[PDB]
Design a protein around this motif. Structure first.
Motif, PDB file in Angstrom:
ATOM      1  N   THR A  62     -11.015  -2.140   9.882  1.00 16.29           N
ATOM      2  CA  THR A  62     -10.488  -1.855  11.210  1.00 16.29           C
ATOM      3  C   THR A  62     -11.607  -1.827  12.246  1.00 16.29           C
ATOM      4  OG1 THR A  62      -8.710  -0.591  10.178  1.00 16.29           O
ATOM      5  CG2 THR A  62      -9.044  -0.274  12.524  1.00 16.29           C
ATOM      6  N   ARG A  65     -12.513  -5.542  12.897  1.00 18.50           N
ATOM      7  CA  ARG A  65     -11.464  -6.276  13.597  1.00 18.50           C
ATOM      8  C   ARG A  65     -11.196  -5.686  14.978  1.00 18.50           C
ATOM      9  NH1 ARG A  65      -6.449  -7.266   9.735  1.00 18.50           N
ATOM     10  NH2 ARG A  65      -5.951  -8.791  11.373  1.00 18.50           N
ATOM     11  N   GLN A  69     -13.238  -8.196  18.414  1.00 15.32           N
ATOM     12  CA  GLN A  69     -12.021  -8.644  19.112  1.00 15.32           C
ATOM     13  C   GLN A  69     -11.066  -9.397  18.185  1.00 15.32           C
ATOM     14  OE1 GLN A  69     -11.001  -7.876  22.317  1.00 15.32           O
ATOM     15  NE2 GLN A  69     -12.750  -6.468  22.321  1.00 15.32           N
ATOM     16  N   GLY A  70     -11.016  -8.970  16.925  1.00 19.52           N
ATOM     17  CA  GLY A  70     -10.089  -9.529  15.966  1.00 19.52           C
ATOM     18  C   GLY A  70     -10.506 -10.833  15.331  1.00 19.52           C
ATOM     19  N   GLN A  71     -11.750 -11.269  15.516  1.00 21.94           N
ATOM     20  CA  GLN A  71     -12.148 -12.577  15.010  1.00 21.94           C
ATOM     21  C   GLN A  71     -12.753 -12.507  13.614  1.00 21.94           C
ATOM     22  OE1 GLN A  71     -11.435 -15.471  16.624  1.00 21.94           O
ATOM     23  NE2 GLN A  71     -10.355 -14.183  18.110  1.00 21.94           N
TER      24      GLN A  71
ATOM     25  N   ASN B  30      -4.744 -13.564  15.712  1.00 21.88           N
ATOM     26  CA  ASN B  30      -5.831 -12.642  15.397  1.00 21.88           C
ATOM     27  C   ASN B  30      -6.204 -11.802  16.603  1.00 21.88           C
ATOM     28  OD1 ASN B  30      -6.443 -13.086  12.621  1.00 21.88           O
ATOM     29  ND2 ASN B  30      -7.324 -15.066  13.185  1.00 21.88           N
ATOM     30  N   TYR B  33      -4.520  -7.595  17.829  1.00 19.14           N
ATOM     31  CA  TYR B  33      -4.532  -6.789  16.616  1.00 19.14           C
ATOM     32  C   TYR B  33      -4.588  -5.316  16.985  1.00 19.14           C
ATOM     33  CZ  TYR B  33      -5.879  -4.698  12.211  1.00 19.14           C
ATOM     34  OH  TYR B  33      -5.930  -3.912  11.083  1.00 19.14           O
TER      35      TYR B  33
END
Lengths: 75, 55
Positions: A62, A65, A69-71, B30, B33
């Motif tokens: 977490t 991610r 930035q979630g990449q 993605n 999130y």
């Protein structure tokens, strides 16, 4: 002279080439160390292979991610 | 009655090129999130606040 032992996880992170420094930033505060940083042939994404303590690995995915930035993604 | 439409692909390419300001450069989910509807519903049910999310 008895001692204690803790388990260490092996972690591989798939991420773009820009968030790699952010991965080095996040793993620095959970008592780990990066062992391999390797580009994927035929792909712009990199792989980061490291060892981490298992007691420090709570919320680790977490943290990556959220901070990248979630990449980035980890197992 | 002006109800249904179908275009050709260069027409869609041109209308996508002209509208580059009102659109995002995202490619995949993605992004969003812990920042989508289900995470907001979960933060609603647990009465906690996501950083950047609603209260």
């Amino acid at each position: 002279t008895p001692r204690l032992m803790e388990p260490y996880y092996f972690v591989e992170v798939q991420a773009p080439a820009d968030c790699v420094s952010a991965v080095y930033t996040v793993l620095a505060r959970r008592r780990g160390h990066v062992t391999q940083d390797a580009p994927i042939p035929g792909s712009p994404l990199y792989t980061i292979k490291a060892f981490i303590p298992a007691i420090d690995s709570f919320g680790f995915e977490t943290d990556l991610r959220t901070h990248t930035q979630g990449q980035a993604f980890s197992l | 009655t002006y109800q249904r439409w179908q275009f050709t692909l260069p027409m869609m390419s041109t209308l996508y090129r002209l509208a580059n300001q009102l659109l995002t450069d995202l490619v995949d989910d993605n992004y969003f999130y812990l920042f989508d509807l289900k995470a907001f519903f979960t933060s609603k049910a647990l009465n906690m606040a996501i950083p950047g999310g609603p209260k």
